[PDB]
């Protein structure tokens, strides 16, 4: 009966940002102030709505996207931004209606000597469209010389590992991010706040 936000925010494993996760939320009651009442979040920013107003709204579906990035990239998880993440990994639309929530996960996602399991896309021939996802691993070709499937001078594997170490500066520490997007359709509204 309650929307399963605990399973999203409290998941044991989080995806790499290039292969970001998405859960569809529907047919449930969502207590958002449950979320924003917690001081646990270093970012909790909504666009086109208020945290409180949400409990008084309804929606066709809610999507919860989630992934890990660097602290200093959290600012790219926002409408209108550019940079490696916004351009090549996870792109919100200019008119994003939703909330972006994040928290430092250095204690779970860093490892002595480096956690290299979290990856990002470093090279892409064009920028992602909003909510587009690219998990391909084709060699990226700079300049004119075909790669023919081989890494080399002008040919690079397109994903690079963050390699998080507990001792990084905070800007380079891992953050877990959840993006909530609120879908209004010409169809039945199945996700509502406790005020409706």
């Amino acid at each position: 009966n309650l929307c399963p936000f605990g399973e999203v925010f409290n998941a044991t494993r989080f995806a790499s940002v290039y292969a970001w996760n998405r859960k569809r939320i529907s047919n449930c009651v969502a207590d958002y102030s449950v979320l924003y009442n917690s001081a646990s979040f270093s970012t909790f920013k909504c666009y086109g709505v208020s945290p409180t107003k949400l409990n008084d709204l309804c929606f066709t579906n809610v999507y919860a996207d989630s992934f890990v990035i660097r602290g200093d990239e959290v600012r790219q998880i926002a409408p209108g931004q550019t940079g490696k993440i916004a351009d090549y990994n996870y792109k919100l639309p200019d008119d994003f209606t939703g909330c972006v929530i994040a928290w430092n996960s250095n204690n779970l996602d860093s490892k002595v000597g480096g956690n290299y399991n979290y990856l990002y896309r470093l090279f892409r021939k064009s920028n992602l469209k909003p909510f587009e996802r690219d998990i391909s691993t084709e060699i990226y070709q700079a300049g004119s010389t075909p790669c023919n499937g081989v890494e080399g001078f002008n040919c690079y594997f397109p994903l690079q590992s963050y390699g998080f170490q507990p001792t990084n500066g905070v800007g380079y520490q891992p953050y877990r991010v959840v993006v909530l997007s609120f879908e209004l359709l010409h169809a039945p509204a199945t996700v509502c706040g406790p005020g409706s």
């Epitope: 940079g83 490696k84 351009d87 470093l122 064009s126 700079a142 300049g143 080399g152 001078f153 002008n154």
Partner: antibody, heavy 117, light 110 residues
Framework: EVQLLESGGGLVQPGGSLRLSCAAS????????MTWVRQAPGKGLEWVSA????????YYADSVKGRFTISRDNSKNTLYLQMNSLRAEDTAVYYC??????????WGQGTMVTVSS | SVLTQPPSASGTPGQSVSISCSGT????????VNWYQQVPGTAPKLLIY???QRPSGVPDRFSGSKSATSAFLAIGGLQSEDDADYYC???????????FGGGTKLTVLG
């Protein structure tokens, strides 16, 4: 701890030849493409030539094609540039650099080549 | 064909500056951009790769950004020791090796 130590520059007359060397240490040389970039006095940077980690693929700017040959000796961590048919306009500081993620991430401090009569 | 940079830039100590690099869809628009710093008398040093990534040891007051056909290097907290020629570089779909812009001489005004 990475070092790229160049040598072999000097003064030659037009039509002469020179062989530059770049001695690499402090990284896994054979895993990286390597490149030469030159800079004429008071001018900008010009990519010259590059070579794959194994040495089995080489790349050249049009300005030096047919005159310069890049090679490497992975048993000695040494990168070479053989320069034949030298012209006044090849006068420059020649840098070797390691290639990393589409960029030149470590550069030697250069060796000066003067082509003059 | 060519990457174009303004020949000079300046700011006063502790302020910011932005250095631009203009090209075309077939180079800057399609390929990762790098930035290099060359203090006179020394070799170029990589500041920015893959448009906006810093190698280890480059402080976060250097940052890179890119528009459709232009790239930009921003330098905050200017110091005198930032006096140098700054070069953008990228690849072009028609050439085997990278291009460099003509360089921008930065002077922190004294």
């Amino acid at each position: 701890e990475v070092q790229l130590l160049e040598s072999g520059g000097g003064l030659v007359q037009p039509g002469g030849s020179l062989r530059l060397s770049c001695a690499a240490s402090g990284f896994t040389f054979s895993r990286f493409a390597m490149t030469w970039v030159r800079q004429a006095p008071g001018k900008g940077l010009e990519w010259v030539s590059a070579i794959s980690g194994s040495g089995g693929s080489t790349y050249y700017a049009d300005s030096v094609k047919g005159r310069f040959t890049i090679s490497r000796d992975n048993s000695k961590n040494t990168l070479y540039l053989q320069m034949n048919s030298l012209r006044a306009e090849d006068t420059a500081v020649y840098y070797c650099a390691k290639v990393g993620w589409g960029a030149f991430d470590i550069w030697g401090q250069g060796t000066m080549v003067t082509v003059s009569s | 064909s060519v990457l174009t940079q303004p020949p000079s830039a300046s700011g006063t100590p502790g302020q910011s500056v932005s250095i631009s690099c203009s090209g075309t869809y077939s180079n800057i628009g399609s390929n990762p951009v790098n930035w290099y710093q060359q203090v006179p008398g020394t070799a170029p040093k990589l500041l920015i790769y893959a448009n906006d990534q810093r190698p280890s040891g480059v402080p976060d007051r250097f940052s890179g950004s890119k528009s459709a056909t232009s790239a930009f290097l921003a330098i905050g907290g200017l110091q005198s020791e930032d006096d140098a020629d700054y070069y953008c570089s990228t690849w072009d779909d028609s050439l085997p090796g990278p291009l460099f812009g003509g360089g921008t001489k930065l002077t922190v005004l004294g």
